[PDB]
Amino acid sequence: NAPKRPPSAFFLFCSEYRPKIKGEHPGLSIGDVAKKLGEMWNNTAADDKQPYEKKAAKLKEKYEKDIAAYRAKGKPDAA
């Protein structure tokens, strides 16, 4: 029922690095270490974006369609 926004390229990255920066930053929050990632991703390894992208992309892509397909109907239910 009603799909819920999968990863965003940066989401993969976020997960992978949180505990590394946090690793040395056991004083930050998932609001600051998050801000760090928030930026590092832009200015990450541009060739590392590629894998992250193909994954988040595939998942969100499905979503937008199945969502569009779960909205198109429900109420008019006459095509």
mmCIF file of N, CA and C in Angstrom:
data_model
loop_
_atom_site.group_PDB
_atom_site.id
_atom_site.type_symbol
_atom_site.label_atom_id
_atom_site.label_comp_id
_atom_site.label_asym_id
_atom_site.label_seq_id
_atom_site.Cartn_x
_atom_site.Cartn_y
_atom_site.Cartn_z
ATOM 1 N N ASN A 1 0.893 -1.195 0.000
ATOM 2 C CA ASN A 1 0.000 0.000 0.000
ATOM 3 C C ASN A 1 0.922 1.234 0.000
ATOM 4 N N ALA A 2 0.369 2.365 -0.377
ATOM 5 C CA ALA A 2 1.082 3.681 -0.446
ATOM 6 C C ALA A 2 2.604 3.633 -0.178
ATOM 7 N N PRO A 3 3.372 3.349 -1.212
ATOM 8 C CA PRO A 3 4.868 3.359 -1.178
ATOM 9 C C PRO A 3 5.473 4.449 -0.278
ATOM 10 N N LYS A 4 6.662 4.195 0.210
ATOM 11 C CA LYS A 4 7.362 5.164 1.095
ATOM 12 C C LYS A 4 8.846 5.449 0.765
ATOM 13 N N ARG A 5 9.021 6.501 0.005
ATOM 14 C CA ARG A 5 10.352 7.026 -0.467
ATOM 15 C C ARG A 5 11.643 6.247 -0.061
ATOM 16 N N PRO A 6 12.112 5.333 -0.889
ATOM 17 C CA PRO A 6 13.421 4.632 -0.680
ATOM 18 C C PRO A 6 14.647 5.596 -0.718
ATOM 19 N N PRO A 7 15.848 5.072 -0.531
ATOM 20 C CA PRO A 7 17.141 5.808 -0.683
ATOM 21 C C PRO A 7 17.243 6.865 -1.792
ATOM 22 N N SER A 8 18.236 7.701 -1.608
ATOM 23 C CA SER A 8 18.521 8.821 -2.562
ATOM 24 C C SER A 8 19.945 9.024 -3.089
ATOM 25 N N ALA A 9 20.751 8.002 -2.979
ATOM 26 C CA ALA A 9 22.183 7.973 -3.433
ATOM 27 C C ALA A 9 22.995 8.369 -2.214
ATOM 28 N N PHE A 10 22.519 9.449 -1.660
ATOM 29 C CA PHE A 10 23.152 10.031 -0.452
ATOM 30 C C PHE A 10 22.735 9.196 0.748
ATOM 31 N N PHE A 11 21.579 8.602 0.649
ATOM 32 C CA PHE A 11 21.079 7.766 1.771
ATOM 33 C C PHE A 11 22.014 6.566 2.004
ATOM 34 N N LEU A 12 22.432 5.935 0.933
ATOM 35 C CA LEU A 12 23.346 4.754 1.055
ATOM 36 C C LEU A 12 24.579 5.234 1.828
ATOM 37 N N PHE A 13 25.168 6.225 1.224
ATOM 38 C CA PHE A 13 26.389 6.887 1.754
ATOM 39 C C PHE A 13 26.266 7.239 3.229
ATOM 40 N N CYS A 14 25.126 7.807 3.512
ATOM 41 C CA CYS A 14 24.830 8.240 4.906
ATOM 42 C C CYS A 14 25.053 7.103 5.879
ATOM 43 N N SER A 15 24.412 6.024 5.554
ATOM 44 C CA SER A 15 24.511 4.802 6.401
ATOM 45 C C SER A 15 25.965 4.362 6.607
ATOM 46 N N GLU A 16 26.599 4.105 5.496
ATOM 47 C CA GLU A 16 28.024 3.657 5.474
ATOM 48 C C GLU A 16 29.008 4.511 6.269
ATOM 49 N N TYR A 17 28.862 5.808 6.174
ATOM 50 C CA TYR A 17 29.789 6.710 6.908
ATOM 51 C C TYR A 17 29.358 7.149 8.294
ATOM 52 N N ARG A 18 28.086 7.258 8.603
ATOM 53 C CA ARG A 18 27.688 7.685 9.987
ATOM 54 C C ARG A 18 28.660 7.167 11.082
ATOM 55 N N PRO A 19 28.859 5.868 11.211
ATOM 56 C CA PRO A 19 29.714 5.246 12.272
ATOM 57 C C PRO A 19 31.225 5.432 12.113
ATOM 58 N N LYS A 20 31.635 6.092 11.064
ATOM 59 C CA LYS A 20 33.091 6.303 10.839
ATOM 60 C C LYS A 20 33.392 7.670 11.424
ATOM 61 N N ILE A 21 32.581 8.594 10.994
ATOM 62 C CA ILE A 21 32.719 9.995 11.462
ATOM 63 C C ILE A 21 32.301 9.898 12.930
ATOM 64 N N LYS A 22 31.176 9.298 13.215
ATOM 65 C CA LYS A 22 30.684 9.136 14.623
ATOM 66 C C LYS A 22 31.804 8.402 15.378
ATOM 67 N N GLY A 23 32.415 7.487 14.660
ATOM 68 C CA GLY A 23 33.540 6.657 15.193
ATOM 69 C C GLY A 23 34.499 7.528 16.019
ATOM 70 N N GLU A 24 34.802 8.648 15.414
ATOM 71 C CA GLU A 24 35.715 9.676 16.002
ATOM 72 C C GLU A 24 34.920 10.826 16.652
ATOM 73 N N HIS A 25 33.677 10.881 16.261
ATOM 74 C CA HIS A 25 32.667 11.876 16.726
ATOM 75 C C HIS A 25 31.594 11.187 17.621
ATOM 76 N N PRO A 26 31.969 10.528 18.707
ATOM 77 C CA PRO A 26 30.984 9.979 19.688
ATOM 78 C C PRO A 26 30.508 11.108 20.623
ATOM 79 N N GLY A 27 30.438 12.268 20.027
ATOM 80 C CA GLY A 27 30.012 13.519 20.685
ATOM 81 C C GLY A 27 28.945 14.190 19.807
ATOM 82 N N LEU A 28 28.859 13.776 18.559
ATOM 83 C CA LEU A 28 27.849 14.380 17.638
ATOM 84 C C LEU A 28 26.507 13.651 17.707
ATOM 85 N N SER A 29 25.597 14.177 16.932
ATOM 86 C CA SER A 29 24.226 13.659 16.817
ATOM 87 C C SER A 29 24.075 13.288 15.356
ATOM 88 N N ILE A 30 22.921 12.769 15.083
ATOM 89 C CA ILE A 30 22.539 12.326 13.718
ATOM 90 C C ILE A 30 21.894 13.511 12.979
ATOM 91 N N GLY A 31 22.276 14.630 13.506
ATOM 92 C CA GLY A 31 21.859 15.973 13.041
ATOM 93 C C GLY A 31 23.137 16.710 12.624
ATOM 94 N N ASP A 32 24.242 16.403 13.267
ATOM 95 C CA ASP A 32 25.525 17.084 12.926
ATOM 96 C C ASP A 32 26.357 16.161 12.059
ATOM 97 N N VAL A 33 26.519 14.941 12.494
ATOM 98 C CA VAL A 33 27.310 13.947 11.711
ATOM 99 C C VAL A 33 26.570 13.856 10.359
ATOM 100 N N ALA A 34 25.282 14.063 10.466
ATOM 101 C CA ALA A 34 24.361 14.035 9.314
ATOM 102 C C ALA A 34 24.696 15.268 8.486
ATOM 103 N N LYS A 35 24.837 16.424 9.099
ATOM 104 C CA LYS A 35 25.175 17.645 8.286
ATOM 105 C C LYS A 35 26.508 17.410 7.553
ATOM 106 N N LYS A 36 27.435 16.800 8.249
ATOM 107 C CA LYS A 36 28.778 16.493 7.688
ATOM 108 C C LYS A 36 28.539 15.681 6.427
ATOM 109 N N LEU A 37 27.917 14.535 6.567
ATOM 110 C CA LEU A 37 27.629 13.667 5.379
ATOM 111 C C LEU A 37 26.969 14.532 4.309
ATOM 112 N N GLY A 38 25.957 15.205 4.782
ATOM 113 C CA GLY A 38 25.116 16.147 3.976
ATOM 114 C C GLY A 38 25.920 16.908 2.913
ATOM 115 N N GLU A 39 27.122 17.225 3.323
ATOM 116 C CA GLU A 39 28.099 17.974 2.480
ATOM 117 C C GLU A 39 29.105 17.025 1.817
ATOM 118 N N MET A 40 29.731 16.192 2.617
ATOM 119 C CA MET A 40 30.739 15.227 2.069
ATOM 120 C C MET A 40 30.268 14.497 0.806
ATOM 121 N N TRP A 41 28.996 14.199 0.767
ATOM 122 C CA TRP A 41 28.370 13.490 -0.389
ATOM 123 C C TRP A 41 28.481 14.238 -1.716
ATOM 124 N N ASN A 42 28.298 15.520 -1.615
ATOM 125 C CA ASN A 42 28.362 16.412 -2.804
ATOM 126 C C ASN A 42 29.769 16.363 -3.358
ATOM 127 N N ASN A 43 30.597 16.597 -2.393
ATOM 128 C CA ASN A 43 32.047 16.640 -2.524
ATOM 129 C C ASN A 43 32.625 15.271 -2.091
ATOM 130 N N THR A 44 32.000 14.216 -2.571
ATOM 131 C CA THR A 44 32.461 12.839 -2.238
ATOM 132 C C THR A 44 33.340 12.460 -3.422
ATOM 133 N N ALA A 45 33.424 11.189 -3.639
ATOM 134 C CA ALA A 45 34.223 10.633 -4.744
ATOM 135 C C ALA A 45 33.160 10.446 -5.800
ATOM 136 N N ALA A 46 33.192 11.377 -6.695
ATOM 137 C CA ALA A 46 32.253 11.426 -7.850
ATOM 138 C C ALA A 46 32.046 10.085 -8.591
ATOM 139 N N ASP A 47 32.974 9.167 -8.438
ATOM 140 C CA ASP A 47 32.892 7.825 -9.113
ATOM 141 C C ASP A 47 32.273 6.745 -8.208
ATOM 142 N N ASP A 48 32.048 7.185 -7.009
ATOM 143 C CA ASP A 48 31.449 6.373 -5.908
ATOM 144 C C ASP A 48 29.962 6.690 -5.907
ATOM 145 N N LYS A 49 29.638 7.802 -6.514
ATOM 146 C CA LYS A 49 28.223 8.229 -6.588
ATOM 147 C C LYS A 49 27.588 7.180 -7.470
ATOM 148 N N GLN A 50 28.208 6.928 -8.590
ATOM 149 C CA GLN A 50 27.675 5.913 -9.549
ATOM 150 C C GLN A 50 26.976 4.664 -8.951
ATOM 151 N N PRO A 51 27.645 3.863 -8.150
ATOM 152 C CA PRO A 51 26.997 2.692 -7.495
ATOM 153 C C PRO A 51 25.791 3.136 -6.649
ATOM 154 N N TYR A 52 26.035 4.034 -5.724
ATOM 155 C CA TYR A 52 24.944 4.547 -4.832
ATOM 156 C C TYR A 52 23.723 4.943 -5.664
ATOM 157 N N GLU A 53 24.004 5.713 -6.683
ATOM 158 C CA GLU A 53 22.971 6.209 -7.613
ATOM 159 C C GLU A 53 22.194 5.062 -8.212
ATOM 160 N N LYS A 54 22.836 4.229 -8.987
ATOM 161 C CA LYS A 54 22.109 3.074 -9.602
ATOM 162 C C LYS A 54 21.219 2.310 -8.614
ATOM 163 N N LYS A 55 21.591 2.320 -7.357
ATOM 164 C CA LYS A 55 20.762 1.588 -6.353
ATOM 165 C C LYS A 55 19.582 2.480 -5.948
ATOM 166 N N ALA A 56 19.859 3.592 -5.306
ATOM 167 C CA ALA A 56 18.746 4.508 -4.888
ATOM 168 C C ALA A 56 17.784 4.793 -6.048
ATOM 169 N N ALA A 57 18.352 5.040 -7.202
ATOM 170 C CA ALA A 57 17.569 5.341 -8.428
ATOM 171 C C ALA A 57 16.572 4.235 -8.722
ATOM 172 N N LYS A 58 17.081 3.039 -8.804
ATOM 173 C CA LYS A 58 16.198 1.871 -9.106
ATOM 174 C C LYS A 58 15.011 1.780 -8.132
ATOM 175 N N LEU A 59 15.337 1.850 -6.872
ATOM 176 C CA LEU A 59 14.300 1.772 -5.801
ATOM 177 C C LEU A 59 13.276 2.939 -5.837
ATOM 178 N N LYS A 60 13.741 4.165 -5.946
ATOM 179 C CA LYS A 60 12.805 5.340 -5.976
ATOM 180 C C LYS A 60 12.003 5.348 -7.271
ATOM 181 N N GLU A 61 12.644 4.914 -8.315
ATOM 182 C CA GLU A 61 12.009 4.847 -9.647
ATOM 183 C C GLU A 61 10.760 3.962 -9.480
ATOM 184 N N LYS A 62 10.945 2.733 -9.051
ATOM 185 C CA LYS A 62 9.777 1.806 -8.859
ATOM 186 C C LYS A 62 8.674 2.568 -8.107
ATOM 187 N N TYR A 63 9.069 3.108 -6.979
ATOM 188 C CA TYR A 63 8.133 3.896 -6.110
ATOM 189 C C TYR A 63 7.275 4.871 -6.895
ATOM 190 N N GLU A 64 7.878 5.908 -7.411
ATOM 191 C CA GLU A 64 7.109 6.920 -8.196
ATOM 192 C C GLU A 64 6.061 6.338 -9.144
ATOM 193 N N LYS A 65 6.357 5.171 -9.653
ATOM 194 C CA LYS A 65 5.397 4.529 -10.599
ATOM 195 C C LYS A 65 4.273 3.819 -9.865
ATOM 196 N N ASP A 66 4.640 2.986 -8.937
ATOM 197 C CA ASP A 66 3.626 2.235 -8.149
ATOM 198 C C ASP A 66 2.765 3.194 -7.334
ATOM 199 N N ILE A 67 3.334 4.336 -7.039
ATOM 200 C CA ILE A 67 2.587 5.330 -6.245
ATOM 201 C C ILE A 67 1.577 5.981 -7.173
ATOM 202 N N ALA A 68 2.080 6.355 -8.312
ATOM 203 C CA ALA A 68 1.242 6.997 -9.355
ATOM 204 C C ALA A 68 0.091 6.019 -9.673
ATOM 205 N N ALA A 69 0.419 4.747 -9.604
ATOM 206 C CA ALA A 69 -0.573 3.666 -9.895
ATOM 207 C C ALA A 69 -1.538 3.379 -8.739
ATOM 208 N N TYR A 70 -1.184 3.852 -7.574
ATOM 209 C CA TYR A 70 -2.039 3.640 -6.362
ATOM 210 C C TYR A 70 -2.863 4.913 -6.099
ATOM 211 N N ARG A 71 -2.560 5.933 -6.858
ATOM 212 C CA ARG A 71 -3.262 7.242 -6.731
ATOM 213 C C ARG A 71 -4.284 7.283 -7.863
ATOM 214 N N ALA A 72 -3.817 7.027 -9.064
ATOM 215 C CA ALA A 72 -4.692 7.015 -10.283
ATOM 216 C C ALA A 72 -6.105 6.451 -10.007
ATOM 217 N N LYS A 73 -6.130 5.455 -9.153
ATOM 218 C CA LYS A 73 -7.386 4.756 -8.749
ATOM 219 C C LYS A 73 -7.598 4.794 -7.229
ATOM 220 N N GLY A 74 -8.652 4.131 -6.817
ATOM 221 C CA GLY A 74 -9.029 4.043 -5.382
ATOM 222 C C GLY A 74 -10.438 4.586 -5.172
ATOM 223 N N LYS A 75 -10.660 5.748 -5.729
ATOM 224 C CA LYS A 75 -11.992 6.424 -5.614
ATOM 225 C C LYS A 75 -12.872 6.391 -6.883
ATOM 226 N N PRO A 76 -12.388 6.773 -8.048
ATOM 227 C CA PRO A 76 -13.242 6.836 -9.272
ATOM 228 C C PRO A 76 -13.702 5.438 -9.692
ATOM 229 N N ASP A 77 -12.782 4.559 -9.421
ATOM 230 C CA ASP A 77 -12.863 3.087 -9.687
ATOM 231 C C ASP A 77 -13.764 2.709 -10.889
ATOM 232 N N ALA A 78 -13.629 3.506 -11.918
ATOM 233 C CA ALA A 78 -14.402 3.310 -13.182
ATOM 234 C C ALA A 78 -13.482 3.734 -14.340
ATOM 235 N N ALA A 79 -12.234 3.340 -14.211
ATOM 236 C CA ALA A 79 -11.136 3.622 -15.198
ATOM 237 C C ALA A 79 -10.645 5.075 -15.032
#
